[PDB]
Structure 1
Amino acid sequence: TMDEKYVNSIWDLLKNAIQEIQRKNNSGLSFEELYRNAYTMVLHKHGEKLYTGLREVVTEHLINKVREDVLNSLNNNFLQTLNQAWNDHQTAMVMIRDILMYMDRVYVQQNNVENVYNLGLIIFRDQVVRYGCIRDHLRQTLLDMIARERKGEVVDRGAIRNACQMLMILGLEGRSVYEEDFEAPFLEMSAEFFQMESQKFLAENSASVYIKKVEARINEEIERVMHCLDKSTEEPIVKVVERELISKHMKTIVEMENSGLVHMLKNGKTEDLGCMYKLFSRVPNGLKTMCECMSSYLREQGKALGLDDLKSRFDRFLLESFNNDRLFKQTIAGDFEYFLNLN
């Protein structure tokens, strides 16, 4: 067959051009001439040879050259070399889509296949970013930088920002790559840090100081997400901070001797008691624990007694510190109905 040798020859012309774009030699390439060869290929029902061929050329470049350049930089400027490889791939794929535009508008549209841009993202994801050693090193580098910053060290936030935005784009208008490769081990590492930091604060600080320190960590983790990561990570990290520091120590915080809720009710620390209400409202069974400890103290004081002095004091705590919550209101009202039952 003439065309079996002719179409293989017209492809070699386009194959050489794509390879020239990969070498950044696009400067001396003719768009007009190269577009006609791709235009004639699609019209003569030979788009299969062009599409399958494109995949094989891009795969060749990302395995033999791009993957090796990243693997030979694992110890010196890893994130910088990987980001440069990512930017070079994006610049190449745009100009590859530029010359093969007729295939990107006619062939991929009616045959229902991935476009030049999406095809490039899949090969760069599977052969470079998600490749064994690179995938592990990217995870270990990003997690160490966050762990160092939490200790009080200065890290390249921009390098973390670029690596996270790269993982988001490689998910093909999704967060599947960013979640699996970065978010999941990040929340697992963070939970281990927040639990160890919780144990420190419960032994070297007061209950009032603890609540303010948790709020400081909530606002610190929001800043890290907004400046270094994707803003979709804001809710999952805050929930980890809330679980490890509040939820796992709810009864402990309120039962702190000469510092907890009972101590705050005695001394009448209005603004300080309000801080506990603002933090415990974030977690489930938080305000329930505050009510149970309050009812335990209120019932004992009313038992000891006259009663109009207690109701006036607890109404002041309800409106100012507990923001007139219906759960706290029925707890106070329920305890005063119990004192009338006694006599």
Structure 2
Amino acid sequence: MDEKYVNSIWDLLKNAIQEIQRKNNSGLSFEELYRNAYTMVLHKHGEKLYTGLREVVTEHLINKVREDVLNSLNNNFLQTLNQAWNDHQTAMVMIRDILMYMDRVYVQQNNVENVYNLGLIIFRDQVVRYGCIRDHLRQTLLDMIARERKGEVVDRGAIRNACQMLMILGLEGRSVYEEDFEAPFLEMSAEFFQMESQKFLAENSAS
């Protein structure tokens, strides 16, 4: 139809998406708005909704979770990380199911990744693989695992939650998580146990 109709449809869809991102998702009528978004991807542009989804998701992530992680890098860093992750994951669940059943003809004709995969990829690109969050997370996990290995006990369920989160973030298998976690931890473990063996060969005997 006319450009005014699709412009109004997009404006109201953007308003609804912003309201959802502001912790108002479950309590929001969405049937008519999603039918309007379907009319959008049906009229001319066959990826308007998909593009708008990607832009809205990445903007919301950069505004909310990128700032939150950097603001609390020392106070319950991993804890707040996991909490924001679970919030983003239920946003997924809801938004996921809907635009994922839309990624049915999008894997039959467009042959692209599903919106669950799109959300996982954008979260990986904008949070975990950030220029500052990645190194900070690596350093803190190495520090806490070294302190645990020293003899004193620390939290252990949180590390399992983080590793499961990274595995889910892999989204294909053990490609990203294996490298990112193992390799620095591989080097740290190798150095630590080399030093331990060097100390033990001199401080004890073969008995």
Is the CA contact (8 Å cut-off) linking 1:38 and 1:102 kept in structure 2?
no
Q: Kindly indicate whether the alpha-carbon contact (under 8 Å) linking 1:24 and 1:92 is maintained by their aligned counterparts in 2.
A: no
Dislocated runs of 4+, deviation >6 Å: none
Do the aligned residues in 2 keep the contact of 1:80 with 1:159 (CA within 8 Å)? yes
Is this contact kept in 2: 1:149–1:155, CA < 8 A? Answer: yes
Q: Secondary structure at the match of 1:79?
A: helix
Q: Give 1:112's aligned residue.
A: 111
Residues 10 and 103 of structure 1, relative CA distance in 2, 3 Å threshold = farther
Identity score, percent = 100
* Matches of 1:143 and 1:89, distance apart in 2: 26
CA deviation digits over 1:192-217, x for unaligned, max 9?
Answer: 0111110121112221xxxxxxxxxx
Between Structure 1 and Structure 2, whose CA radius of gyration is higher? 1
1:59 to partner: Cα distance: 0.8
TM-score (norm 1): 0.56
Q: Residues of 1 paired with 2:4 and 2:66: CA distance?
A: 33
> Closer, same or farther in 2 for the Cα pair 1:47/1:12, shift >3 Å?
farther
Deviation readout 1:260-307 (Å, 9 max, x if unpaired): xxxxxxxxxxxxxxxxxxxxxxxxxxxxxxxxxxxxxxxxxxxxxxxx
CA distance in 2, matches of 1:141, 1:190: 15
Distance 1:167 1:29 in 2: 31
Task: Check conservation: 2:79, 2:158, Cα contact below 8 A.
Answer: yes
Is this contact kept in 1: 2:41–2:48, CA < 8 A?
A: no
Q: Structure 1 205/168 Cα, relative in aligned 2: closer, same or farther at 3 Å?
A: same
From the two aligned structures, give the one with the greater helix fraction: 1
How many angstroms does 1:179 deviate by? Answer: 2.3
Q: Rate the CA distance shift 1:198–1:102 in 2: closer, same or farther, 3 A.
A: closer
Which position in structure 2 is the counterpart of 1:175?
Answer: 174
Gaps of 5+ in 1: 208-342
**Alignment: residue pair count:** 207
Task: Call closer, same or farther: CA 1:158–1:3 in 2, change over 3 Å.
Answer: farther
Conserved 8 A contact 1:39-1:102 = no
- C-alpha distance in 1 between matches for 2:101 and 2:196: 58
Q: CA deviation at 1:45?
A: 4.8
Tell whether the 8 Å contact from 1:14 to 1:34 is kept in structure 2 after alignment. yes
Deviations 1:129-163 (A, max 9, x none): 11011101110111111100111111111111111
Which runs of no fewer than 5 residues in structure 2 stay unpaired?
none
Cα–Cα, structure 1 residues 138 and 125, in superposed 2: closer, same or farther, change >3 Å?
same
